[PDB]
Amino acid sequence: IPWKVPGLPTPIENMILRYVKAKADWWTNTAHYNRERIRRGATVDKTVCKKNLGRL
Amino acid sequence: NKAPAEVQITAEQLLREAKERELELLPPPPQQ
Amino acid sequence: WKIPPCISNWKNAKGYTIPLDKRLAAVHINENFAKLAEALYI
Amino acid sequence: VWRNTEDEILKAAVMKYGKNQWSRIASLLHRKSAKQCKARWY
Amino acid sequence: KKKRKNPDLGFSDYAAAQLRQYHRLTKQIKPDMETYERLREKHGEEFFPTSNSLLHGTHVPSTEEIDRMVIDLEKQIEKRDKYSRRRPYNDDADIDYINERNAKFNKKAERFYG
RNA sequence: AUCGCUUCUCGGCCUUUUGGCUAAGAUCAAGUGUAGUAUCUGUUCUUAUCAGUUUAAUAUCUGAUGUCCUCUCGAGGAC
């Protein structure tokens, strides 16, 4: 969703955009990593299979 | 008897009924 | 420096009513579609 | 079909719960599923 | 005859309101030059101490004095108690608020989403 | 004009108020037969006698609603 709050000082908006990009990088790098593990066969954990299908 | 009603049951009426159902505020701790 | 409050569409922790309007607020078309579609009709 | 009582419940339900909890709202209503409530809203 | 006015503005810092209040209270006070001269002829040069200059252990106050400051305390306390003027419980307008916390949250939302 | 008290009105605070996270955390919602009573609900009633039917009495039901002139069911009169 395109997120835009009506009157919110810019320094705050830049802080938030910066930190959401931090968490997004972390989230999708974890998705890449777990997908390689699942593809080649290393983990059988059953919460990672479902978490990863939802991420992708 | 199915027949067109008179005024209506518009939402604000529901919100006002629920707000006036105000029983969860309850009675004050009794002074003794 | 005043900070607007957040009204989320997912969390309503305290169960509060907010009117539809304030709940709500918080497209391009190229010009080559015309040339394609009319070339097809012709 | 849809009856004015029901969609007047739906306006208030959306006003309270938010625009993303369709299963809650669907539970407020007898004989409606969350798919139909969401459709009627949109 | 005399004339002046002072308009209210933004609370900008707590310091501004504090200062206004001090101005008012200061203007009120009226000092007795009698007691001043009486206190003066006893101590003389001690009257005019720099930050670092002079020293006498403690000045012990007659109770009657202490009552003055206590009374002013109670007055300022009351005046401060009245800081927020409440708007009377008006049911006349449409109610889309479940409780008073919700009613006030809806009011804050009204002031930020026009 | 000034001081104080009271009444109403308005502005400003009103953060003093939306416990954190994930795979929106996940998921989903399946019954009588007969009549009949009562209660709600909706509704419907000035028109003038009299005859009858009827009924404890009403009611209901049925049946018509003084002649002559005349002017506009209406009116002044010979009656």
The whole-angstrom separation of Cα E73 and Cα E94 is 43
Amino acid type, E107: K
According to the entry, how was the structure determined? cryo-EM
Resolution in A for the shown PDB structure? 3.3
Q: Which residues of A3-21 are buried (b: 16+ CB within 10 A; e: fewer)?
A: eeeeeeeeeeeeeeeeeee
Amino acid type, C22: K
In A1-56, which ranges are continuous DSSP H helix?
Answer: 10-40, 46-55
CA angle at E93 for the pair E87 and E97, rounded to the nearest 5°: 80
Q: Is A6 in the E-facing interface, judged by CB distances under 8 Å?
A: yes
Tokens representing residue A50 in the block: 């479902």
Distance between the alpha carbon (CA) of E88 and the C1' atom of F7, Å: 15
End-to-end Cα, chain B, rounded Å: 56
Q: Which residues of E35-58 are buried (b: 16+ CB within 10 A; e: fewer)?
A: eeeeeeeeeeeeeeeeeeeeeeee
Neighbour-count burial of D26, counting CB atoms closer than 10 A to its CB (0-12 exposed, 13-18 middle, 19+ buried): middle
Chains near A with 3+ CB pairs less than 8 A apart are: C, E
Residues of chain B with C-beta less than 8 angstroms from the C-beta of D5: 9
Q: Is A8 in the C-facing interface, judged by CB distances under 8 Å?
A: yes
